[PDB]
Each structure stands twice: as C-alpha cells, then as structure tokens.
Design a protein around this ligand. Structure first.
Ligand code: PIN
Lengths: 173, 173
C-alpha cells in the first residue's frame, strides 16, 4: 500500500492539451489499487509520474506526466483526486525556491510545519487564496514571496512563529 | 516506512564538521529507526538519513546524507545506511553522470535489469569495474555520461538497454 507515498491534490484531474501525450485507464475498486500499479509501473507502456482516482466512475487514470508538465492542465472535479509520484517532483531548490513544490514539511531545527490553512498556533495572512500558483498546501515548506532565506513555514511550536527549512540547492559548486 | 529510503549495505557515514548534529539510540530493528526518521520525532534537526548498527542494535540519525559536503562514506560489515529519498536529487544535471536516485523503470515503462544480473542481457557494467558510479540494484545510471541520460539494461529480452525518463533539473521553472 504505497498511496501515502504520493503528493495528493483533492478535486483535481489532469487534461492533456497535446493530443500526442499518452494515458492509460482502468476500472478498479479503490485508489490504493491505482497507487500500487503506478509504484510498480506494471503493465504501463510509459513511466508513471502521476495518477488520478475517479471516485464516481471507479477508475484509475495513469499518466506519463504530472501537473507541472508541458502540454497538460489541471481540471476541477469533485469526483477526482490527483496523486503525483514524488520521484518526478523536483526535490531540490532552484534559486530561492520560489518554484519549490516538494513535500518537505519540517523546519531546519526539526519542527513540524503548521498548515498554511491554519491560524494555530500562528495567526497569519499567507492564505492559499492570496497566493495562487505558490502551492500553499498542507504544511509544506514554501517561499511564496521569493525571500532570500529560501522555503520556510510557520511552525507547530507556539514559541517559534516561523523558521526556514533545510532543502538543498539543486546545483551550487 | 523503511522503503522510503535508499539502502546502502555494509556502509556508514562520518562527519568532518563537528558542528553537525547527530542523535543515537539503542533500538531493536532498522524498521524502528526508519519510523523515527520518517516521523522526525524528538530529533532537533531534519532527518535525512540514518545508519543501523546491526551488532549494537543502535540507530544513528543524521541531518546529512552521503552527498553532503564533509561526510565520509565508510565500509563496515555491521552497518547499513538508509538515505531519505526526499534528499537525494531526483533530477539530472548535464547528462546525469552524478544521478544517484532510485528510479528503476525505462522511458517505455520496462523494469530495469539488475547491474549484477547477466539475465536476460549479458554485459560488462559491473559495480567492481565502475567504483563510485553506484551501479547497485537495478537503478537507472549514466556511468559514462552518455547522451540520453541515465539508462539501464532492460528486463525485456527484446530490448537490451533503454534510457529512463529522469527529468532535467531545468525542465520545470
Ligand atoms: O511571521 S510574519 O507573518 O509576521 C511575516 C512572514 N515572514 C516574513 C519574514 N520571513 C523571512 C523570510 S525567510 O527567511 O523565512 O525565508 C518569512 C516569514
């Protein structure tokens, strides 16, 4: 059961503008079944980078792309959950990590990040709705304003309002 | 939980900068170290790797891994090193000579053949012949820095070798 290993985006599927891109689909019972097949990459004629479970039609849709790939866009739908393979979500930072979309959620000193959508312990104005494009989801380390310190988060320790996270640069010689 | 880690058998790490934090604890199994590192519970840093001492049943948790500047990868028969996949670069620089991630599927979805196996395909890309290149398991690798990036011998007898689909670090914003 590998489903917990993916980055989940609720109420979301992906559509390919480029008709060339390939998809595979199958009627299934549960989302973990899609996860298993993606992780194993069994019986797919491509590298699985993401999948969607359609809870209304009970289908898996496996993709050789994710939400950040060229030629694909997100689509809203209550019936869909998107699961993106973390092996295809860049896990290092470019520049100050404005564009970081990885799932690290602990600060440099080991403190669990507070969720962006929560005002507890720390009341703040970094609401996801104020920062579209910046992926202020769950409690992920992010740098929505492109500040010199790199990705950071509000902290679950009431005594520490915010702290930077310790995410490595992709390339710095 | 232990599967979220890349395992290097018979290996440990040693710091050269004595300001790097470490935490140790006598435990029962390596699985218990993985759990504590995943939960990041009671560690005053971001856990990026751990070593299990099988002879002492001790966990050593680290805020570094083998690619961190100033740590020494060392042989030791009683040690196994486990590195958190979130901290092993999952994109390629240049042609990907330095790629050390755990992707093991080709671009057309085929499971890689182990570098140690000669079945279905016989070859001279042995670990011993390529020290430092991490030709372990069936990981996509680029030991000679060839054009298409990391690749592998394929488990399909019809396809000797094929590149994998590891993204360039420059592919996304
Ligand atoms: O806490 S407040 O809501 O008042 C202000 C939010 N805030 C401004 C100061 N920084 C430093 C950037 S970084 O060093 O963390 O990258 C991010 C956190």
């Amino acid at each position: 059961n590998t489903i917990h290993e993916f980055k989940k985006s609720a109420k979301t599927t992906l559509i390919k503008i480029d008709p060339a891109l390939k998809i595979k689909t199958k009627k299934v019972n549960t989302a973990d079944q899609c996860a298993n097949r993606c992780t194993r990459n069994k019986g797919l004629p491509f590298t699985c980078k993401a999948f969607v479970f359609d809870k209304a039609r009970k289908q898996c849709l496996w993709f050789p792309f994710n939400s950040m790939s060229s030629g694909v866009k997100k689509e809203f739908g209550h019936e869909f959950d998107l699961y993106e393979n973390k092996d295809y979500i860049r896990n290092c930072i470019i520049g100050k990590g404005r564009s970081y979309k990885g799932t690290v959620s602990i600060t440099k000193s080991g403190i669990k990040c507070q969720p962006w959508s929560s005002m507890i312990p720390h009341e703040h104005s970094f609401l996801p709705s104020s920062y579209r494009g910046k992926d202020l989801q769950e409690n992920y380390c992010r740098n929505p304003r492109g500040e010199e310190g790199g990705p950071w988060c509000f902290t679950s320790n009431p005594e520490v309002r915010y702290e930077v996270c310790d995410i490595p640069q992709c390339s710095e010689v």
